[PDB]
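ugh ok so i messed up the first submission bc i forgot one of the chains. this is the corrected input, ALL of the components this time, i swear. 274 residues overall. if the numbers dont match what u have on ur side tell me asap before i send this to the collaborators (the ones from the other lab, u know who)
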Amino acid sequence: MLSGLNHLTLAVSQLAPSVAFYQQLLGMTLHARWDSGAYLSCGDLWLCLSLDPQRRVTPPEESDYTHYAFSISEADFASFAARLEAAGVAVWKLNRSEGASHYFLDPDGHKLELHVGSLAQRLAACREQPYKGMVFF
Amino acid sequence: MLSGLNHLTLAVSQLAPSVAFYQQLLGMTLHARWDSGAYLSCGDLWLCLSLDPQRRVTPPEESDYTHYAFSISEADFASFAARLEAAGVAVWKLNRSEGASHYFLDPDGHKLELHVGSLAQRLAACREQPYKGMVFF
Ligand SMILES: CC(C)c1noc(=O)[nH]1
Ligand SMILES: [Mn+2]
Ligand SMILES: [Mn+2]
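and heres the new structure output, hopefully the right one now
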């Protein structure tokens, strides 16, 4: 049986800007780097950056909705988003829902999100105002 | 301060075959489904499947190395991988070895992996046989 997410690997076009983004701007811990990759952690998350000649810097209009959301407390949310805005990090979507989300891009166009709240909270909100066709199990 | 992964959202071209893959084949827990998405969990992982007509199915040879690995125990690894092969799940290939892993594709061409071992175990293995240019912090 599967027990959780083991690691998330992102393909990157250039290692140095990606390490700077994840380690210095986002504050993740850098454990190791080599000529074609790096290992970082963010809480329990193991993140691998893999240098890939096939990776293109992809505008948000040209990629689908696949995205990766990081946990943050409500108290820290606004100052963290403001840090990203000062650094010139692009936003790919406005939050149109209740609850706190900030949608931002990494240097290669991977779609990222800051989100406050758990699955249990989302399910409780949906039980009150379900999406079209929603069934619970 | 970021504290880990909040959720993983995958864009899918057809909801029902994707839900069946993650729930029936991979054994993830289905919490809710609606006309354009589903919420599942795998241990601590919150997985969202989102119906996206912009999702294309690309051969693994022409998509980049971005991929998502799930944890499995040493005792369950070989029999789970054998079950995926017997179900006809397609494989893909990574450029380097990262330990005990099985690489497979989901119905929309997302690159998945079964992996045995933690980041700490990977770092210890790399100390004994490092990648080219490796530095440990
Ligand atoms: C599709 C939408 C309701 C959604 N829920 O979590 C996401 O990441 N997107
Ligand atoms: Mn999201
Ligand atoms: Mn991997």
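quick check: The domain at 1-137 of chain A is CATH 3.10.180.10 (2,3-Dihydroxybiphenyl 1,2-Dioxygenase; domain 1). that seems consistent at least. The pocket of TJ1 (ligand 1) is lined by residues B 7, 9, 37, 48, 50 (CB under 6 Å).
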